[PDB]
């Protein structure tokens, strides 16, 4: 008798989703284990509403574990979930971008096992995609938004290790506290083509707005953004130049039910491996922890048995920090109609792209000279021109 619940906030896709996911584990099972399910949903959510629900549900049906889903991309709700799971020593696995927004992780006492790409894993693809068309990573502009220290350090090490190319020149940061043209002063001091930035969504609107005034939104420039920038939405804000490169997890063609079914299997199979190995009973807490938490502390957790899960044709093994080593990264662009369109896929450490050479289409209108980017034809001949195979 395993327990599970799903939550949906400000969504209109839950009612049928719960029933379809309900019949899933019955056949997906390959072990004569047991499964019980329940579903719920709520409107615009707050920490107080979140915390009240979890023990109300836990005290009701003696919850073995829960799966979480929310949206709107709030940094706060990320730090809200984890510390709840920390004290109650219950395995909680939340699966969606709002929950999957990256965090610096907490003490090993917690059992959260986040479901998304790491900062290092995300960045290394961003640096690698440069090796395709645009040569040198030119500029890095960042605010004081958390997580910058790990980012600028990782890229600096990997650029000074490989000898090939990669002549990074200028890296700058801006103080939002001085919200005036003083930022434009520091911003005006970089001249190059490809600009890489790492900031929050709200500041992204302002900084790109300032650049359009000076002219960095021109036809000759390329902007590269990580996943967290506007990834978890379908309604793009204004001031974003038409034409943008991001590597995100949004998984255009995937379904939450598909993700939930995989998540459910991670719960049951891993616990099945530990329980059957040593006749282990997953002793539940008598309530949410006021006093009765201590006797269950000596009981061994599922961490030795939850790191490795199989089936569904994907090595879903986690790590110490809770980021997968076989994620489903995709790269996506802003088309002419302000509607995001998939471009290429990342799988088994390769850059498969539907585009061979860059499309080079314009920014937001009323600014389009477009008189550059010449094409050249050449013949292989005597030492004027020589051809060779790629090393």
């Amino acid at each position: 008798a395993l327990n599970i619940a799903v939550m949906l906030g400000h969504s209109h896709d839950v009612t049928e989703r719960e029933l379809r996911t309900l019949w899933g584990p019955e056949q997906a099972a390959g072990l004569p284990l047991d499964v019980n399910v329940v579903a719920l949903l709520m409107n615009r959510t707050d920490p107080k509403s979140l915390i009240t629900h979890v023990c109300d549900l836990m005290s009701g049906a003696r919850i073995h574990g829960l799966v979480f889903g929310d949206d709107t991309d709030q940094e706060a709700v990320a730090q809200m979930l984890d510390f709840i799971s920390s004290h109650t020593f219950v395995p909680i696995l939340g699966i969606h971008g709002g929950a999957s927004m990256i965090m610096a992780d907490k003490d090993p006492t917690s059992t959260f096992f986040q479901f998304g790409a790491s900062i290092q894993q995300q960045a290394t693809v961003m640096l690698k995609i440069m090796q395709d068309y645009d040569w040198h990573v030119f500029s890095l502009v960042t605010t004081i938004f958390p997580g910058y220290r790990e980012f600028i350090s990782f890229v600096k090490t990997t650029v000074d290790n490989s000898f090939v190319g990669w002549d990074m020149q200028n890296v700058i940061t801006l103080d939002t506290s001085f919200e005036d043209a003083k930022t434009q002063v520091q911003l005006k001091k970089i001249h190059s083509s490809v600009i890489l930035l790492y900031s929050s969504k709200d500041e992204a609107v302002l900084i790109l707005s300032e650049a359009r005034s000076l002219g960095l939104t021109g036809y000759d420039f390329f902007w590269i953004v990580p996943s967290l920038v506007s990834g978890n939405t379908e309604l793009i804000p204004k001031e974003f130049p038409s034409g943008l490169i991001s590597v995100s997890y949004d998984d255009w063609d995937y379904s939450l039910e598909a993700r939930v079914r995989d998540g459910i299997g991670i719960l049951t199979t891993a616990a099945s491996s530990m329980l059957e190995k040593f006749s282990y009973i997953p002793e539940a807490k008598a309530s949410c922890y006021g006093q009765m938490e201590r006797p269950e502390v000596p009981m061994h957790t599922l961490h030795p048995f939850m790191v490795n899960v199989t089936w569904d044709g994907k090595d879903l093994s986690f790590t110490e920090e809770g980021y997968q080593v076989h994620p489903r990264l995709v790269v996506i662009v802003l088309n002419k109609d302000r509607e995001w369109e998939k471009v290429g896929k990342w799988e088994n450490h390769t850059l498969s792209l539907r585009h061979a050479v860059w499309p080079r289409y314009k920014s937001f209108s009323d600014s389009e000279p477009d008189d550059n980017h010449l094409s050249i034809v050449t013949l292989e001949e005597a030492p004027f021109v020589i051809v060779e195979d790629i090393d």
Epitope: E341, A356, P359, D371, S375
Partner: nanobody, 117 residues
């Protein structure tokens, strides 16, 4: 990618027509669009072209009879042809090249234009 040509028919000499070729794609800014003609007994021949920059080249053979135009907003290139002569009887084709891709020569089903008395 796939295109589609249309606009043909029968028109008396000295008349006019409006041929059109269209294709679906999100990058439609950057494609060379060319018109090809191939009559019975003759090799395929170029007629009119449009560049990515926005320049127009017209073949000297039948220069001045027709004109080319491209709409950046809507993915369709249509060819406005005027002062028809019997020498123009053929099946006109539309094509694109470059901005990615491979196996680069793209040909529609074909539209036959007939000029006669």
């Amino acid at each position: 990618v796939q295109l589609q040509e249309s606009g043909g028919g029968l028109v008396q000499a000295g008349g006019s027509l409006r041929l059109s070729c269209a294709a679906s794609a999100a990058a439609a800014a950057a494609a060379a669009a060319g018109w090809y003609r191939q009559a019975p007994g003759k090799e395929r021949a170029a007629a009119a072209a449009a560049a990515a920059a926005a320049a127009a080249a017209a073949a000297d053979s039948v220069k001045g009879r027709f004109t080319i135009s491209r709409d950046n907003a809507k993915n369709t290139v249509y060819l406005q042809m005027n002062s028809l002569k019997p020498e123009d009887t053929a099946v006109y084709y539309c094509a694109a090249a470059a901005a990615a891709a491979a196996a680069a020569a793209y040909w529609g089903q074909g539209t036959q234009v007939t000029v006669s008395s």
